[PDB]
Design a protein around this nucleic acid. Structure first.
Lengths: 7, 214, 497
DNA sequence: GTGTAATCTACTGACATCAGAGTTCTTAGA
DNA sequence: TCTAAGAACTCTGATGTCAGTAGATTACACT
């Protein structure tokens, strides 16, 4: 799943 | 939930030149970090931001040294995002003329995390580094770095100008090192954690979906 | 029909000594039957169609009052919008003591002439000023021959009644009750629009229904545009609305007057009065404050000129029912704006229905509104039961949801059932069937609110305290299913609650 | 100028509707 | 050792709508 820069 | 955000950018020299047909990785990742900072700004998410604009022509870091933790200027520590930080990103940044390692900046941001994420309550951490892989770096603490990233629950992502699907042998070996590092973080799936910059634009242009817990 | 027009029903009861006291048995009374009918329909109309018109006028009476000072006709209350101060008047007459009052105020029942009676009612409908949508007259008599004696009166009657039929007025009598004498071919086959001693048509006029209605009012007419050049004229109509209670009105203690709210906005630093220009809108983000013009706080929404934007078409399996957003609306061309467009509407409808595929579009209901994505799922007409409209033919409007709506669910794992208990649950689900008709139920809230309204209005001894189908009939479920609850307990239930 | 049209634009009743505000409930909680 | 923050729902008030009505304004027009 999208994480960090995307979460 | 809570999260800590520490964005790591390079202000070196290589990104100061690029193909005329495509925007420089400097300005490209600049718009990216600008559009991304806007994202966590509008959403009232309690995520805290710190910035590392490494590759600095000077050195303004808590871990200043002659060669250890060098050429680093933390824009601001790990607190809530706010506008003036975005504006100061938009204005204060300046093209550089030096070249500096990122693994150094990785450890510096790591130390900021360990020095602050226990000082105040958090639940999970990220570490993001934007660079062009034009650094002279040694693989010394990589095992230890990945170790205590696992221990402190810090997720590392890299963002590179080239696309997985013409770069220097320096850039190519850095990419292979990066693949090694990401697999050493999670495993084979570490390939997905590789990110280019145009894809960052495509995947990020939208504003933050207004999530809501029921 | 003409919308501002209104539905008007005049009431007309045989006030002779004929049925004032027939009372063959001791269970009802024809006047007490008609008055009950009038009271019931009138209170139903109160809530139902508060804007309509009613009037009650008795004939054959001994006292006299009407517009034209005729003989033996008494206009109890003229044509006017329904109101309590009239239900009170009618109630004054409901009862044995009530009928004593009725007889000793206006008369036992003198001679009469339905020719003249219809004259009277005609003048009544004429006198009103507002426009009338439907005009209907209800006799309440039983002397199935108005008069077999003076035929000339009968000729005059048929003549005038034909006239009223021609002046735009309908007429209807419900044959209430007579010993024998329960026929309509005697003098009325040519009046109203086989036969027995009591009228079914008067039964429902006691059904006491109390919803409310609005006519064929277009919610909004917008121009469906296929492309930037072809446009058609569609009327976004509405077919389910969730009636909230009528909004209350604020009144003074000492006098029950309207109180005319006067909210305003004014300064705290000084006793000034901020006029609407002198205000600003604001938000707080990122520890920094924001200003926009009040004009801008709505300018921040201008997205498309009003209308519908059909883009493509889509396979009806994909429009998943799983993601309803707001009540659907209905689509049907309005020939008024773009002449002939009804053709293209029909074309789209026929062809889409034939090829079993949706039609997606952008909906901007009014100016200043962001657009949503709505699908024009076509609908075929159905009439079969009695060749009356059931589902009107055209397109629906299933609003399709936006990403900001999915509301990510707190994932949990699945555990399949064993075919044994599901095989028995087949029997359980079979047993408790029931056909669900659309208008099955009522709001207990709306219904009870309306009730309590009549209660307080009419100084009743009691609220009606309606019993409403919403609550389940518990014993029915306990019985018709049998003790299978213990079966599924022993199948798929251990000791813990 | 004078006078009669035609017809746009008004207002209102009425009905939907966003938003705004009043209210009870879970977690995080000195 | 418990106090806010969001939630949620309902409710209220404006904004905009539609059909209708009818007024006043504006065009047309007079040898």
């Amino acid at each position: 799943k999208p994480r960090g820069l995307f979460s | 939930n809570k999260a800590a955000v520490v964005l790591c950018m390079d202000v070196g020299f290589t990104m100061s030149n690029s193909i005329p047909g495509i925007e420089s990785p400097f300005e490209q990742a600049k718009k990216v970090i600008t559009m991304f900072v806007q994202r966590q700004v509008f959403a009232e998410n309690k995520d805290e931001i710190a910035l590392v604009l490494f590759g600095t022509d000077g050195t303004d870091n808590p871990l200043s040294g002659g060669d250890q933790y060098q050429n680093i200027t933390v824009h601001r520590h790990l607190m809530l995002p706010d506008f003036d930080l975005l504006e100061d990103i938009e204005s204060k940044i300046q093209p550089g003329s030096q070249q500096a390692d990122f693994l150094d900046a990785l450890i510096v941001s790591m130390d900021v995390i360990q020095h602050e994420t226990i000082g105040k309550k958090f639940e999970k951490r990220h570490i993001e580094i934007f660079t062009d892989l034009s650094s002279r770096f040694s693989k010394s603490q990589l095992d230890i770095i990945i170790h205590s990233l696992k221990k402190c629950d810090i997720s590392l992502q890299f963002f590179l100008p080239f696309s997985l699907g013409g770069i220097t042998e320096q850039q190519k070996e850095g990419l292979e090192i990066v693949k090694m590092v990401m697999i050493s973080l999670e495993g084979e799936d570490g390939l997905d954690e590789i990110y280019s910059f145009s894809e960052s634009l495509r995947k990020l242009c939208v504003f933050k979906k207004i999530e809501r817990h029921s | 029909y003409k919308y501002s027009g209104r539905d008007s029903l005049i009431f007309l009861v045989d006030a002779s000594k004929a049925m004032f006291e027939s009372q063959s048995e001791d269970e009802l009374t024809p006047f007490d039957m008609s008055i009950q009918c009038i009271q019931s329909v009138y209170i139903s109309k109160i809530i139902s169609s508060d804007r309509d018109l009613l009037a009650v006028v008795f004939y054959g009476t001994e006292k006299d009052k009407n517009s034209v000072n005729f003989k033996n006709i008494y206009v109890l209350q003229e044509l006017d919008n329904p109101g309590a101060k009239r239900i009170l008047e009618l109630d004054q007459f409901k009862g044995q003591q009530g009928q004593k009052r009725f007889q000793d105020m206006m008369g036992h029942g003198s001679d009469y002439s339905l020719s003249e009676v219809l004259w009277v009612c005609a003048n009544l409908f004429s006198d009103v000023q507002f426009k009338m949508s439907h005009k209907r007259i209800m006799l309440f008599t039983n002397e199935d021959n108005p008069h077999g004696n003076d035929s000339a009166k009968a000729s005059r009657a048929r003549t005038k009644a034909g006239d009223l039929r021609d002046t735009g007025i309908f007429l209807d009598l419900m044959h209430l009750k007579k010993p024998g004498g329960f026929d309509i071919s005697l003098f009325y086959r040519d009046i109203i629009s086989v036969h027995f001693e009591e009228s079914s048509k008067l039964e429902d006029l006691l059904r006491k229904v109390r919803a409310k209605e609005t006519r064929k009012r277009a919610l909004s007419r917008l121009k469906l545009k296929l492309n930037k050049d072809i446009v058609i004229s569609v009327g976004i109509y509405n077919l389910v609305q969730k009636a909230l209670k009528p909004p209350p009105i604020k009144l003074y203690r000492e006098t029950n007057e309207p109180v005319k709210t006067k909210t305003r906005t004014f300064n705290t630093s000084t006793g000034g009065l901020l006029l609407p220009s002198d205000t600003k809108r604001s938000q707080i983000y990122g520890s920094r404050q924001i200003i926009l013009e009040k004009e801008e706080t709505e300018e921040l929404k201008r997205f498309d000129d009003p209308g519908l934007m059909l883009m493509g078409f889509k396979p009806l399996v994909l429009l998943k029912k799983h993601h309803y957003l707001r009540p659907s609306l209905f689509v049907y061309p309005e020939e008024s704006l773009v002449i002939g467009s009804s053709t293209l509407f029909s074309a789209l409808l026929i062809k889409c229905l034939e090829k079993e595929v949706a039609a997606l579009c952008r909906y901007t209901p009014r100016r200043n509104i962001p657009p949503y994505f709505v699908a024009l799922v076509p609908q075929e007409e159905e009439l079969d039961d009695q060749k009356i409209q059931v589902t009107p033919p055209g397109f629906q409007l299933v609003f399709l949801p936006f990403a900001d709506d999915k509301r990510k669910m707190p994932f949990t794992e699945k555990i399949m059932a064993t075919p044994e208990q599901v095989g028995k649950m087949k029997a359980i689900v079979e047993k408790l069937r029931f056909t669900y008709r659309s208008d099955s139920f009522e709001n207990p809230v709306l219904q009870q609110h309306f009730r309590n309204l009549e209660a307080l209005a009419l100084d009743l001894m009691e609220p009606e305290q309606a019993v409403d189908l919403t609550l389940p009939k518990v014993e029915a479920m306990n019985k018709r299913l049998g003790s299978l609850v213990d079966e599924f307990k022993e199948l798929v239930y251990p000791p813990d609650y």
